[PDB]
Amino acid sequence: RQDLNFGQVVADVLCEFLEVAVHLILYVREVYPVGIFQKRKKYNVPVQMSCHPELNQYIQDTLHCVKPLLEKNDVEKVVVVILDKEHRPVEKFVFEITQPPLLSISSDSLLSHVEQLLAAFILKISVCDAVLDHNPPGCTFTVLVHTREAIQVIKDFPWILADEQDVHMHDPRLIPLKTMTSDILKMQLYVEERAHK
């Protein structure tokens, strides 16, 4: 790893992206009904996003807390965890963020080609039911943030350590979806799926 801060512009790009991706994941994995969703133009393309103000504020609050951590390159993973009725995870959408040595050599340029680069992640999420089985009815979600070895930003939006039950998933299928290697970060999106559910 290198140690370079992403800076504000990159942090804000990633948070705006993560917001869209969460909405899209909730839609395609049917965590919430299609009825609370209306299309919005994001990255020059119609993406389904929730019109439910409280769900929206929750996703927004979550990412507002992640943003300063991103700015300082202190985030290793942001994970959208889908939990069944027994609060056991059935699916994880992992956004793994790294900055390997020599990253920037022959890399893409996120800021210059935002829509181009991120739209591919949108496409992959939107068709990922091709490589997953249907989830059980009654699933919920949460967001887990893995911090680097070396967040309570908002009034009345506290964070706590996740429990083992949030994280334990036996025998997971791994499906890589998309990787982006840009000037100052690498982001890999992949899904972990519970074997039988």
């Binding site: 009904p33 609370i36 769900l55 994970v79 943030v145 911090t147 939006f157 964070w159 706590i160």
Partner: peptide, 13 residues
């Protein structure tokens, strides 16, 4: 290193 999660639950609809 966490992982950390929001204490509040995701809203039900």
């Amino acid at each position: 290193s966490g992982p950390w999660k929001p204490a509040k639950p995701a809203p039900s609809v």
